[PDB]
Design a protein around this ligand. Sequence first.
Ligand SMILES: Nc1ncnc2c1ncn2[C@@H]1O[C@H](Cn2cc(CNC(=O)c3cc([N+](=O)[O-])cc(O)c3O)nn2)[C@@H](O)[C@H]1O
Ligand SMILES: [Mg+2]
Length: 214
Amino acid sequence: GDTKEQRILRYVQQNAKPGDPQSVLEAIDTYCTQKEWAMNVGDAKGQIMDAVIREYSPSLVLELGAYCGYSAVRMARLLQPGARLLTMEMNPDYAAITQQMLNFAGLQDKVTILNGASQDLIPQLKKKYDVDTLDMVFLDHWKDRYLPDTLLLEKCGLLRKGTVLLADNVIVPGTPDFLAYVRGSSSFECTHYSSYLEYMKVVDGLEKAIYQGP
Ligand SMILES: Nc1ncnc2c1ncn2[C@@H]1O[C@H](Cn2cc(CNC(=O)c3cc([N+](=O)[O-])cc(O)c3O)nn2)[C@@H](O)[C@H]1O
Ligand SMILES: [Mg+2]
């Protein structure tokens, strides 16, 4: 009784300043550097994420896997007014942590949390949420869903030329099938950003894959 995710949030509520997203991010990072490792994107990879976001200024972002709401907070705090983030989370407990994390950050009005698995929700985006195409996609869910969900996004017509895919953990725990596909495919221009597994000295990285169209 009493999960790590609940402890992380409790620490944020005690040490972070309400309505200040930088503060919420620093609290989580501190908690996870000092007390318990947890699978947030972390500040090192979060900084690359920030740079990618500022470059494209997406109006509509889709995130796969929210977890505690760390990357959701990172991204939604950089979004222009009227720009939105959709985040898919299959575990209702983590989704609740995320909602409260975003509420504390004062970012709740920029984000919609979708409850359910990506494979079930993605085919419903156009019909049930009036989504034309996506400006950007952050992949941070089950590693072996990266490729299937990409092909699924393409099938559902959610990708246009210019859609940026940003994938966490392509080295650790690794997504070798996703990497071979986007790199080998002329439908994706790919950039690797070398970095470190969150809160550790193990080499990890993000992959940016830009859809070129059919
Ligand atoms: N199909 C899915 N649809 C929606 N949400 C999903 C799905 N699969 C997992 N999630 C969510 O990802 C979050 C966190 N997560 C991520 C994974 C797969 N990713 C990792 O395991 C991971 C693992 C490490 N690691 O092992 O060092 C480091 C990282 O940065 C990671 O993202 N499992 N739970 C959880 O909230 C879970 O509900
Ligand atoms: Mg990750």
